[PDB]
Design a protein around this ligand. Structure first.
Ligand code: CA
Ligand code: CA
Ligand code: CA
Ligand code: CA
Ligand code: CA
Ligand code: CA
Ligand code: ZN
Lengths: 267, 397, 97, 268, 397, 132, 49
């Protein structure tokens, strides 16, 4: 039933023992610079040398990091996302990287009726949409606002404005009233379960700026977060194709989920 | 067996007591024993060998008695005695090897070689002398069905086994909890490891247990128990349980808390020691149960807080270990140990003469296999061959 | 007398009956090699020595192993002799490419 | 705790071992229109509470048609019961919807403008959903030349769907195909049927039992979760569902994939 | 114990042989033995009982000898003998019960009752007569340190177990692969089942194994191996491994493919049988390994093919089984079989007199627990009580 | 004498060497063919090697028999001889190294050293029979 | 010992010196045919006897 997860495995310390799919997410800038009609066919042929049979490599194009952050989808067993560094979008890159690289379990969040609180450090509020504007008013034990009248939202403390993806972290154990713009945004109460080895992120350009932990005392640089200096998208793609072995070796496809959603939904 | 031991003892006492110049009052009784040995062995034909590369040899005894008219031994007396003793010692050596190279599923303790079968007759009981050595003493005791006991220094009671058991794992092996252990000879080293350092555990305490059942009951054992397994405190790359891949282990050692060592006999706790290290005593047991916990330090300096996060990436893996060595013990059965050369002698004889693999012992007298399956027939055969090996060692240097 | 030599520079000389080493005459080895057909030491000298010590193989079995007889080799493999199986597995793994 | 492996489970045959969930009920707009009561969802909630379901645990989802509902029927709920109205001319649509929501499907993308596609196994289908799917396939011989069709010209392709909201195409296994899906509105995926989905049950409210959720023509299994009732009043239908919720739940089960022991087995 | 057996044997022989009209030449030796027993027992005082509800009894012997001068015995002689025989039989009965009801964790093979401890003395060695029953002769052989053997018809060597193992499983239990087994008394019934009938298995063959280790080595065993597990061939509703729910098992029986039965001693194959059913012989073994395959029928008539589809709905589950019965065997240690009544006698005495549970045996002399945890002390006590039970049954019926 | 007497292949625990004068240990480091991400991060393709792969062996002689006298863990004859020489400040002689240094003695265990060492060991045992 | 078997279905076992039939054993026969060299029975057992 449970795959025997409760049972142990005994292995010895001496005994000698000795069609996956690959998605490549890239920005439209890359396609525009490549400026070839059959570059996907070319890269498919080249992957065939590294051993991925024809029909196993798929290429997904997204206009921007902002747009791609609106409910990103993970389609293949191995999902490699090429992220173009922009000095003005560091937090957006960090939020997208956190969402894709880490598994999340999210519950619905009806904000017009209920106060919400973060339980532990693993709980966040993830909001996605065309425009997510979030204003939070913390409450004391008496259900009165702290520095903000509950009735008037203009006194609420803004946390995000017209953002495609927001990972809000507020003080744990204190109720909040949120005036989130639900017309164009959907906000869910999520918990971070663990890493998702299915997906790797390759940042082109930049200076190694990605914090995938809400904790300020920790900015882990896992093995699936990579960075390369770039000046030609053909060079970037040739690098990825030539070193697909290393990237796959660093990844793991057992994290493939049944659905392409970046989070597990529970009602 | 008793007659073979008596022959060996008489020959040893002759080679050491019969020396030129010694008073005849020092060797009168020994010479009476020697003369009776010669009289009893005279006129008997023996054949030894014929198995593997052990040559077939024939032995005939027609010897004269040692004299008894001298008040002091001189060169000639010792010379004649040595001439007789050399032949007797060669016969004893070949009888012992012939007996050691043989086994039997049924009646393992019974004599197997033709020479020892012949010696088991009643005419040879006249030469019995004194059975003083440990192994012959235990042989007679077990023949009468008394309580035997062999004293071992570091008994070789645990078969070699280096393994690990995982209680939490994933395909990526980047967050593991479990135990690793080496049991070898008389030493158990066990280390429980937790990658999360009990961040999410209930009470920040992760329990580890290790049960080592012994194949025989040890008694009055002195045991050294130290709080760290030096063998599992360095980085490792280890094959996965199935063997498909390899995982990384990067230990960082904490003290084990709530250490409980329980020595049990037939599932009944005979001895128990809590948070006790150094020399402890187990009077009677056949199972060892080590319980130890990894407790996340309640207070950490910055260099330790950096080590132990709450997020998944766990670079350093908390590890708590125990080492347990049986310095000396007493066993009713016979075991190889670090101070005796009986197993070495038996294996050496078999290897030297290329004895074909028999139906009882494993090939090459492999102690791992012997102890792993130490059946009663194997115990009987092993006790017989060890007794013969001790008898041989009395004479052959 | 059996004279064995390998590409890795290890050379032995022993006796067919009891696998006990004797001095290795390079000149005699060359003389025998020039004419007599050489036998691929599938079970090398170390493996044969270990096997004889820990199993006391028969004279016929030792003869067949020295000649590299498939019958005896497969008989041991099926009998689950760890030494022979380890040597054969070593050869198969050395057949890398 | 030992996720991702398959350790044998041992149990005894001679030992005696002497609410929190959430239910979602999918119905068509016709039901609400006939009931013609604003507080009917509240009334059903109270009756479910009587049956033992805490208030707020029963969700009522409304779809306009079977055809509309077939477009990505997302059912995230511990238990799901779909009351689908039988129509004589929609037997294949009902069967496709039932198969999609009653079996677990592992789907990979399909870029038909770069690759030819072949189905490698009896459990491999092409599931396409969207506003308007028009699938036209050309089988290719070993030379990558169309069989009975022209690879260059789509009008010679053989059509297997026309403006279908949902369709499950099954072509001859082992042979490459060139597809001409209308991707401008409809998306097609290469899906593999992992097995049954215990979360969902479908109640056909109307005609006879015609659903078959197996491509194999020799079998038309009628599992536990495929129920059928006759009806003249939607109030009577809902009363039946409420009264026999216990039987329905017993026929169903919690989704195996979403169980926290399926981690590294295609969920959690 | 030898003295007690001699007492019971003498009394049984007196009952059988001292009959009216029989020639005194028929019982001359018996009457000499009886008079010797009376002489040896005269003037000694014994006490029995005192544990549980067994009454405390005192025995004194002041009997007169029997005549030895008639040609044919008459009624007077028979009555004179019977009066003494009744008292001696009662004494033996109570001594045997006192010995049965007792146990000791240390030296369980030695006498435990004070009466038997007294009979252990040298003065009573004059009562030995004959040692010809199976249990007494095995007792004497064991003391002499020789090979023993008890021959059993249907030995209860398998601890009662009835359980299943699921290698493939889901919460819904709709698609299962695994094995089910009953090991009871002297029989093993095993059945490997696969719901998909190996549709997706490599080469459409599913392998099944079942290993049954024994607590003691059995020799020269006659066994019946048959190709179907009749116990696992009907619809069943079993309860899940953890007891949460229940799952259905609707078996359809196929022939077991590649049947291999291996009898192993010390982990090595002693006997092996391939695709052979009927009567087989296992000469020496302590483990039974059964391997068998479910092979999907390559060719199926329509009625067969309809049973096994390639999709999940599986209404019939392909099952292949084996049944193994140990008809007869020989074991060095005592067991409970279908022919002897020694276990019944011991359990009956203990239950009748309400003996409090001791430190060795399980409550109620539960044979399942005893054979599950058959330890050295348990074996010694069990052999002692069985020997005493046989001695008592010689007289009491 | 340079001839193979015993050979053990991939066997650990207790082994027996009947007669030998040289030990040759051979062992291989095999790069794992399969590695989890944590393992693969350790061994790159290029020069900057931070973690260095190593494989070890530990061979301990529990007991043995020799035709020549040797210092061992159980006997105290070496200690007795060294103690006497140190106590009475015996000048360094022509046979033994200074202070009866056992390392030097057994590195250059010449036959004359063996003869003198057996003599002194026998005398030391004779002395220990009486003096505690 | 000689084990002979034909395609038709006739199998015999006998002794080399004197051709006396012995009960056939098809596990030993299988082992021998797989390992040892096989002789074409130009002169079958019938004619040999
Ligand atoms: Ca404010
Ligand atoms: Ca953002
Ligand atoms: Ca927070
Ligand atoms: Ca449709
Ligand atoms: Ca056409
Ligand atoms: Ca198909
Ligand atoms: Zn019967």
């Amino acid at each position: 039933q449970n795959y025997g997860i409760n049972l142990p495995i005994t292995g010895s310390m001496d005994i000698a023992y000795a069609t996956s799919t690959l998605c490549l997410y890239y920005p439209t800038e890359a396609a525009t610079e490549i400026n070839d009609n059959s570059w996907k066919d070319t890269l498919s042929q080249l992957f065939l040398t590294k051993g991925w049979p024809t029909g196993s490599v798929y290429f997904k194009e997204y206009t921007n990091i902002a747009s791609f952050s609106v409910d990103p989808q993970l389609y293949c067993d191995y999902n490699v996302v090429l992220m173009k560094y922009d000095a003005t979008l560091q937090l957006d890159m960090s939020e997208l990287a956190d969402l894709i690289l880490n598994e999340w379990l999210c519950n619905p969040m009806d904000i017009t009726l209920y106060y919400y609180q973060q339980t532990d450090e693993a709980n966040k509020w993830i909001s996605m949409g065309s425009s997510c504007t979030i204003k939070v008013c913390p409450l004391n034990t008496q259900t009165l606002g702290i520095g903000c009248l509950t009735t008037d939202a203009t006194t609420f403390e803004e946390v995000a404005t017209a953002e495609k993806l927001v990972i809000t972290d507020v003080v744990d154990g204190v109720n909040h009233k949120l005036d989130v713009t639900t017309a164009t945004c959907t906000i869910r109460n999520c918990k971070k379960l663990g890493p998702r080895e299915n997906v790797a992120v390759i940042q082109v350009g930049g200076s190694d700026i990605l914090d995938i932990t809400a904790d300020p005392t920790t900015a882990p640089q896992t093995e699936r977060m990579m960075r390369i200096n770039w000046k030609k998208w053909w060079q970037v793609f040739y690098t990825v194709v030539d070193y697909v072995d290393q990237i796959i070796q660093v990844m793991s496809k057992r994290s493939r989920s049944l659905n392409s959603a970046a989070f597990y939904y529970r009602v | 067996m008793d007659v073979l031991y008596s022959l060996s003892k008489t020959l040893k006492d002759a080679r050491d007591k019969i020396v030129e110049g010694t008073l005849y009052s020092n060797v009168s009784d020994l010479i009476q024993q020697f003369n009776q040995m010669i009289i009893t062995m005279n006129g008997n034909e023996f054949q030894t060998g014929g198995i593997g590369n052990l040559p077939i040899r024939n032995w005939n005894f027609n010897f004269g008695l040692l004299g008894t008219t001298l008040l002091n031994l001189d060169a000639n007396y010792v010379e004649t005695a040595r001439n007789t003793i050399d032949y007797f010692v060669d016969f004893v050596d070949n009888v012992c090897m012939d007996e050691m190279v043989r086994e039997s599923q049924r009646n393992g303790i019974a004599p197997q070689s033709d020479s020892l079968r012949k010696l088991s007759a009643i005419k040879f009981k006249r030469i019995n002398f004194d059975n003083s050595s440990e192994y012959i003493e235990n042989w007679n005791l077990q023949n009468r069905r008394q309580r035997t006991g062999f004293t071992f220094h570091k008994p070789n009671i645990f078969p070699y086994s280096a393994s690990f058991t995982l209680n939490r794992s994933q395909p990526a092996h980047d967050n593991l909890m479990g135990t690793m252990w080496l049991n070898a000879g008389s030493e158990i080293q066990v280390a429980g490891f937790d990658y999360s350092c009990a961040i999410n555990a209930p009470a920040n305490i992760q329990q580890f247990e290790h049960i080592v059942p012994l194949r025989r009951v040890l008694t009055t054992a002195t045991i050294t128990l130290l709080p760290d397994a030096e063998r599992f405190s360095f980085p490792r790359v280890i094959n996965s349980a199935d063997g498909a891949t390899t995982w990384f282990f990067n230990p960082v050692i904490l003290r084990p808390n709530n250490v409980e060592v329980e020595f049990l006999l037939n599932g009944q706790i005979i001895n128990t020691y809590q948070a006790r290290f150094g020399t402890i005593v187990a009077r009677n047991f056949d199972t060892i149960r080590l319980s130890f916990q990894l407790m996340r330090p309640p207070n950490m300096t910055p260099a330790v807080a950096v080590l132990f996060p709450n997020a998944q990436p766990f670079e350093h893996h908390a590890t708590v270990g125990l080492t347990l060595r049986i310095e000396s013990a007493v066993c009713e059965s016979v075991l190889a140990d670090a101070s005796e050369t009986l197993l070495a002698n038996v294996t050496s004889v078999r290897q030297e003469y290329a004895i074909p693999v028999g139906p009882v012992f494993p090939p090459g007298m492999n102690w791992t296999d012997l102890i792993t399956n130490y059946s009663p027939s194997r115990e009987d055969n092993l006790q017989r061959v060890f007794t013969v090996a001790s008898i041989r060692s009395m004479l052959i240097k | 007398d059996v004279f064995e030599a390998g590409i890795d520079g290890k050379f032995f000389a022993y006796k067919v009956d009891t696998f006990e080493e004797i001095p290795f005459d390079v000149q005699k080895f060359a003389d025998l090699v020039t004419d007599s057909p050489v036998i691929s030491a599938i079970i090398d000298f170390k493996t044969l020595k270990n096997l004889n010590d820990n199993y006391g193989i028969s004279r016929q079995q030792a003869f067949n192993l020295l000649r590299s007889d498939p019958r005896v080799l497969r008989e041991f493999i099926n009998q689950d002799n760890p030494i022979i199986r380890n040597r054969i597995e070593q050869l198969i793994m050395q057949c890398r490419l």
